[PDB]
Design a binder for these strands. Structure first.
Ligand SMILES: [Mg+2]
Ligand SMILES: [Mg+2]
Ligand SMILES: [Mg+2]
Ligand SMILES: [Zn+2]
Lengths: 69, 100, 124, 55, 49, 122
RNA sequence: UUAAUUGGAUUCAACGCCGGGAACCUCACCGGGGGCGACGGCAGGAUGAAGGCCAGGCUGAAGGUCUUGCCGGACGCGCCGAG
């Protein structure tokens, strides 16, 4: 069925496609790059390495080392 | 050819008084009257925080309002219906009469 | 190396009814278009069509951050409010289907300074 | 018309569509069984309405 | 100031240059756009000659 | 209208019936001042007593009522002074035409003077 | 850190607490735009005060202001008290 594939309604051709391995990776990279080229909010979040789906960032999502006073 | 009488009140004594008066009226005449059936009491519980601010340990009030009910069946006979229709219940009692 | 959105060129998208275009946009945009444009969005669209027809050669500014980008807006420049100033956004074909507000950030990027007094248990 | 710019919009949902009938506060409104009273105001008038603290 | 003129009046004859809005009666006077009868209170798109 | 317009003399009876017949009719009637307001009153016939005073210069907004006199019945009279015209009916200003429509108990002298003015000059 | 990231509470007895799960409202913060002075009296005002508009500019949008010219008849923030 058309609702079981991992790329329904492809952005270029408009067909319902399923991809594996290198093609899948390159399609994902192309999607992110397209977001970045138009300077959309999501693309900027991708560039800075910050959460993209609306999460709070004050408490969790900490990856680093403690700063001293 | 039977009438259904519904009663409700926040006070048990008044409710009992009205039911007993209707029972006396039904006794004073040749007529069968199914005894006053007690329906389950309606309870309204509201729980609230006590403090106006938000400092200190949280403590709560549990306020309650209780509404009692009764059901009475009688056969619609005009000699008996006039006596019951002219009774006045206290202001804190709701009375509803219907014919089935 | 041309542009295609669901197998259709930009010119073919230009001569498409609104209802027909809704079937190619994603679910959120299809629902928003099916429910109709808001009156402020109507005024903005009137100004956009006027500017396209060759009239109104003055900058177009708007408070409408929830407006969806449509194929007829490509090629223009629109100034979208971000809270305090109108920022310029140039509509490219790959912007079709996105809200305007997505291109006008409302917050400034954070560059942290030194933690102050009280920032750690031993600094209080 | 200038008085148009003093007038409020008549909302039907949200915190702005409900005010306490005793003091006018927005916010913590008790909507149970058609009451429209703030938590503050309900505490001090509950005995007058017939409520009791049995437990 | 004063605004009552441009009505053609002679020594004993009176006739108005600006007609009245047909929804109401005479006496009320329109504008002088030339393009259309503004009418002040209701509005019309008729392209007065 | 204006003193600079010889229509006729200043008959004492005319001022007598145009001035001293409105104070007793002010408390039982309606008053509509203003020549812009009255121009409509006179054209449409709303007014019942047109009392036109000789104080308006030039003959610009006054040159409407005398030409329109012969189109309707317009029982009309003139007022010598303007300072007390509002005092007789209205407010403490100078009035130009105080139109009263259907006044209570103000009929006999008004009819007599209106007939005299009709038989005087129209 | 920021244009603003509104404010209260800091041991037990502050920190899923202020019934505080804020898209608008809530809202107190920030950028921008409009409106409001019962009552006493001053300039004023029917030779019409204050107030209200079809159309098109300015504008995020607006008879808010403006342009074009229509409206209505009695109070009067251009001023001092006062609320
Ligand atoms: Mg805080
Ligand atoms: Mg929420
Ligand atoms: Mg808010
Ligand atoms: Zn309250």
């Amino acid at each position: 069925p058309r609702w079981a594939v991992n790329r329904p309604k492809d952005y270029e051709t408009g067909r319902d496609l399923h991809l594996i391995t290198a093609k899948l990776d390159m399609a994902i990279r192309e999607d992110i790059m397209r977001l970045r080229r138009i300077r959309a909010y999501r693309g900027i979040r991708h560039e800075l390495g910050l959460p993209v789906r609306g999460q709070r960032t004050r408490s969790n999502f900490r990856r680093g080392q403690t700063v001293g006073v | 050819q039977k009438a259904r009488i519904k009663l409700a009140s926040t006070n048990v004594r008044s409710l009992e008084e009205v039911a007993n008066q209707i029972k006396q009226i039904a006794e004073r005449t040749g007529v069968r009257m199914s005894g006053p059936i007690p329906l389950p009491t309606k309870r309204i519980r509201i729980v609230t925080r006590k403090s106006p601010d938000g400092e200190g340990s949280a403590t709560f009030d549990r306020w309650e309002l209780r509404i009692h009910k009764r059901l009475i069946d009688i056969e619609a006979d005009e000699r008996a219906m006039r006596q019951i229709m002219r009774i006045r219940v206290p202001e804190d009692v709701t009375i509803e009469i219907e014919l089935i | 190396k041309e542009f295609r959105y669901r197998g259709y060129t930009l010119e073919q998208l230009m001569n498409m009814s609104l209802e027909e275009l809704a079937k190619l946009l994603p679910a959120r945009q299809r629902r928003s278009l099916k429910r109709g444009l808001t009156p402020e969005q109507k005024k903005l669209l009137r100004k956009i069509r006027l500017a396209k027809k060759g009239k109104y050669n003055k900058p177009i500014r708007t408070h409408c951050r929830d407006m969806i980008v449509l194929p007829e807006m490509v090629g223009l420049t629109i100034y979208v409010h971000n809270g305090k100033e109108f920022v310029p956004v140039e509509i490219k074909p790959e912007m079709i289907g996105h809200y305007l507000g997505e291109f006008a950030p409302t917050r400034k990027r954070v560059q942290h300074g030194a933690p102050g007094i009280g920032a750690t248990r031993s600094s209080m | 018309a200038k008085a148009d710019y003093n007038k409020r919009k008549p909302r039907k949902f949200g915190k702005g569509a409900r005010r306490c009938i005793r003091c006018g506060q927005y916010g913590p409104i008790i909507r149970i069984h058609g009451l429209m009273l703030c938590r503050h105001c309900f505490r001090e008038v509950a005995p007058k309405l017939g409520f009791r603290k049995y437990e | 100031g004063q605004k009552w003129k441009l009505y053609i009046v002679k020594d004993g004859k009176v006739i108005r240059k600006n007609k009245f809005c047909p929804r109401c009666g005479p006496g009320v006077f329109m504008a002088d756009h030339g393009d259309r009868w503004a009418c002040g209170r209701c509005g019309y798109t008729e392209w007065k000659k | 209208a204006k003193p600079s317009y010889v229509k006729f003399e200043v008959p004492k009876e005319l001022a007598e019936k145009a001035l001293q017949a409105v104070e007793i009719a002010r408390d039982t009637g309606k008053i509509r001042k203003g020549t812009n307001e009255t121009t409509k009153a006179v054209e449409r016939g709303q007014a019942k007593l047109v009392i036109i005073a000789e104080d308006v210069d030039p003959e610009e907004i006054v040159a409407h009522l005398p030409p329109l006199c012969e189109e309707k019945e317009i029982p009309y009279i003139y007022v010598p002074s303007k300072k007390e015209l509002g005092a007789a009916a209205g407010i403490e200003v100078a009035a130009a035409s105080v139109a009263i429509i259907e006044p209570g108990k103000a009929r006999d002298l008004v009819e007599e003077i209106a007939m005299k003015v009709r038989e005087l000059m129209k």
